[PDB]
Paper text:
Herein, the structure model of the recombinant human mutant p53R280K DBD (without the four stabilizing mutations described in Reference) was obtained by X-ray crystallography for the first time. Crystals grew in space group P21, which contains four molecules in the asymmetric unit and each molecule comprises amino acid residues 97 to 290. The overall fold of the p53R280K structure is similar to structure of the wt [name] DBD in the absence of DNA. As observed in wt [name] and in some mutant [name] forms, in mutant p53R280K, the L2 and L3 loops are stabilized by a zinc(II) ion, which is tetrahedrally-coordinated to C176, H179, C238, and C242. Additionally, at 2.0 Å resolution, it was also possible to confirm the mutation of p53R280K DBD at position 280, as the density for K280 was clear in all four molecules present in the asymmetric unit. This K280 is located at the H2 helix, which belongs to the loop-sheet-helix motif of the DNA binding surface. In the wt DNA-bound [name], the R280 residue is directly involved in DNA recognition, in addition to interacting with a structural water molecule. In the DNA-bound wt [name] structure, the guanidinium group of R280 forms two hydrogen bonds with a guanine nucleotide of consensus DNA, while K280 (in p53R280K) would only be capable of forming one hydrogen bond with DNA. Superposition of both monomer structures clearly shows that the distance between K280 (from p53R280K) and the DNA molecule is longer, a consequence of the shorter side chain of lysine compared to arginine, as also observed in other contact mutants p53R273H and p53R273C. Due to the increased distance and weaker binding, p53R280K is unable to form stabilizing interactions with DNA, which consequently causes its loss of function, despite other well-established contacts that could be maintained.
The [name] tumor suppressor protein is a central regulator of cell proliferation, DNA repair, differentiation, and death. Structurally, the [name] protein comprises constitutes an intrinsically disordered N-terminal transactivation domain (TAD), a folded core domain or DNA binding domain (DBD), and a C-terminal oligomerization domain (OD). In its folded form, the DBD exhibits a β-sandwich topology with two loops and a loop-sheet-helix motif. The structural zinc(II) ion is coordinated by four amino acid residues, namely C176, H179 (in loop L2) and C238, C242 (in loop L3), ensuring the correct folding of the DBD through the stabilization of these two loops.
Numbering used by the authors: 97 to 289
Write the structure that this text describes.
């Protein structure tokens, strides 16, 4: 099981998210109270990278999904049979991968030879000078309710910064639910508190 321990490391690495609210029409919205992203299938999910100092050139940013519940965590998170066979390739992503990056031609996908886990990595780009974070646009390509995939089990996304040889520089994580009405579901889940 890949580690999910938060680690800001030397560059002060944190994640940020847009403060999108819960109107019925939002496509992606983040709950700080739950540390949980609610988003729609194949829609843009912005995730911000914030650092206190700039990691060096050749730094990379990897995203991987794991099941949140200890009893499912050893199982590889992948797309259901249906979505795996759907005609929705962007030509870069492997069809079994849950997490894609959109709008980045340098994107690299990995099937880990030993663990069988999937992940997606992009070069780290600094923020524009006087803009304060780097944004990556993720797409989640199955719903949390897909039969034969996640099947309503909750998942985490783990975001790592790594150097050009794959050494760990920083790690954060957040829970994700991929669903039809992220605003409504966020509001409903927050009602429990
Ligand atoms: Zn699916």
């Amino acid at each position: 099981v890949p580690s999910q321990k938060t680690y800001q490391g030397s560059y002060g690495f944190r994640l940020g998210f847009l403060h999108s609210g819960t109107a019925k029409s939002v496509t992606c919205t983040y709950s700080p109270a739950l540390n949980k992203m609610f988003c729609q299938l194949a829609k843009t999910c912005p995730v911000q990278l914030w650092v206190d100092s700039t990691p060096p050139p050749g730094t990379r940013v990897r995203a991987m999904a794991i099941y949140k519940q200890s009893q499912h965590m050893t199982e590889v998170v992948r797309r259901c049979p249906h979505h795996e066979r759907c005609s929705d390739s962007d030509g870069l992503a492997p069809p079994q991968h849950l997490i894609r990056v959109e709008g980045n031609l340098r994107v690299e996908y990995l099937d880990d030879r030993n663990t069988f886990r999937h992940s997606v990595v992009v070069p780290y780009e600094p923020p524009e000078v006087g803009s304060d974070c780097t944004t990556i646009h993720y797409n989640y390509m199955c719903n949390s309710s897909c039969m034969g995939g996640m099947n309503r089990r909750p998942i985490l996304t783990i975001i790592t910064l790594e150097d050009s040889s794959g050494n760990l520089l920083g790690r954060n994580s957040f829970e994700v639910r991929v669903c039809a009405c992220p605003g409504k579901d966020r509001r409903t889940e927050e009602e429990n508190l």
